[PDB]
Design a protein around this ligand. Sequence first.
Ligand SMILES: Nc1ncnc2c1ncn2[C@@H]1O[C@H](COP(=O)(O)OP(=O)(O)OP(=O)(O)O)[C@@H](O)[C@H]1O
Ligand SMILES: [Mg+2]
Lengths: 376, 252
Amino acid sequence: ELTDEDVKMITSLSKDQQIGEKIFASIAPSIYGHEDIKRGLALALFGGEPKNPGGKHKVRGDINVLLCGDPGTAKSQFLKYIEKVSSRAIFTTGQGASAVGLTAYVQRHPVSREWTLEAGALVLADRGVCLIDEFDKMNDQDRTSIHEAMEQQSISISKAGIVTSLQARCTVIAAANPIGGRYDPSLTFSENVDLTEPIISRFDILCVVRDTVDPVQDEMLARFVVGSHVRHHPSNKGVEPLPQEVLKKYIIYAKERVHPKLNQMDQDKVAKMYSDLRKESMATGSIPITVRHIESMIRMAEAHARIHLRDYVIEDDVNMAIRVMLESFIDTQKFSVMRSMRKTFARYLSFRRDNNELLLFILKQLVAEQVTYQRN
Amino acid sequence: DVELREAQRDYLDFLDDEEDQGIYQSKVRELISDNQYRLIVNVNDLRRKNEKRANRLLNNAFEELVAFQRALKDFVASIDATYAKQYEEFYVGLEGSFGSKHVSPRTLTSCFLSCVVCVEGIVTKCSLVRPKVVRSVHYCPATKKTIERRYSDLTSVYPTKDEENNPLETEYGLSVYKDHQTITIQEMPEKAPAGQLPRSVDVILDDDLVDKAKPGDRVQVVGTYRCLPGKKGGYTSGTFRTVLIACNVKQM
Ligand SMILES: Nc1ncnc2c1ncn2[C@@H]1O[C@H](COP(=O)(O)OP(=O)(O)OP(=O)(O)O)[C@@H](O)[C@H]1O
Ligand SMILES: [Mg+2]
């Protein structure tokens, strides 16, 4: 895929001034809705900027994503699309139904009969994407291996005689279901998922996919899937999404060439925002905000800049990264704290969110309240 | 053989310990009094008395040990011929401070072949003790003839028919066997590097040492390191199988 004069093509639409919306809408075109999840996956695809000040502070440039949601919401579809669209992308499942496991080992390969070091799946995706379905059904050793990979960005093997440490700088995109098969907003995120706090603490974006009964959305999704079934019958075999091949060409060029530097970030705004969030979160019995959240916001701002190839993070990039990080952090909170932080930080969470979207959301909330009152 | 005669004379002079502290004369008196036919000699004594002899013994183990054992047999005959006649051969064990030879199975490189090595290790294998024949006696009922055949230590033909094809019935009782065993020793896990697998080495024990060490015991084996041959064949690979022909086994 080493072409030339396609740098012109990528730059030609790079200046479109709305390419962000195009790319965010050009992820998994077979999945309706879930726009925020698509945005998060785009940011994960383009990635951040790994930096190790001196040689003693290793900071990962990846953006790990965890999609926790009740079943029947196309999480595995997102993971499979990422598998399809991203080079050096591998897919594995918490169950043993995956070709390659998460943990390293050494053995004679069954077909080649040769003694080889089967590196864990995470290692195979050394510079790519590792998709982990059924993230909440892993083994103890699988959990330990994912923890090691996410924490230290490497794997240490001492199985037979191989005392080695080989690095796995992967971006983990995971899919999981809530405990009991249904996500209950009355409980915080960290407690309605079969995952310990340290594991969840290493994910930069948490997407809480909820299947709530809604006649309009239900009808729209039914039309979508039934039309897909019609169009893929054997006999018959607000922007425009980019073609997938051009999308991956753009991803390659951005991920390989442009390395945005945050010399224009407004430290004042970020510091005040962080202090306010700390005070608010501790004012309530809620999971607090920590430094790693600022780290994740920095990574997402760099990734968003990379999407636009700016080479210099701009105020709007920082604001969008803050929007995404605050959306995730708020949705991880319980029901009451959800509204508390929504109202307290509605300004931040409304960046680049036009009036029509908020008005439609509020009207839908009101009509749903009316429906519930009617049918009780 | 001038060299072998010199070696035997030097060894016999060393064993003739009356002008000196009388240590090894007392040791020979000990071995004869308690009815054993193997002597243990500290290498430090050889170094203190004759550095050339010690170096030759350590660097060329086989012939030097043969000369030392022959001198030992001569000395025990001189002190007492009655006991000396009982045993065909008098063996020797070594101990003391082995400067560069003291190694482990890991450090045991081919550089030490045909030398004297004092290895320390953990015993992993102790094979069943087998009687290896050294001298067979066969009796012919037809010809009334008893024929003795020797079997030199070549570490093979067993006669069954007389000259004119008279069956020979082996005389087990009058035949001479030496008990023999093979053990596998390993480097102590304490001193082995934490990463790689253990490294081991074989040891061959003749009489007086067949069961001196039991499986799973920390031992020190002093002996000769040599190469074993393959069986008769037109083609051979440069590979050789090496073992440690023990001259002494001690519990650490
Ligand atoms: N938003 C959507 N757009 C299009 N198709 C969808 C959407 N949500 C679900 N589907 C379809 O509904 C079915 C269920 O989705 P899928 O099998 O991917 O479930 P899932 O979210 O991975 O569930 P689980 O957690 O049980 O594995 C699929 O056929 C999928 O194509
Ligand atoms: Mg699934």
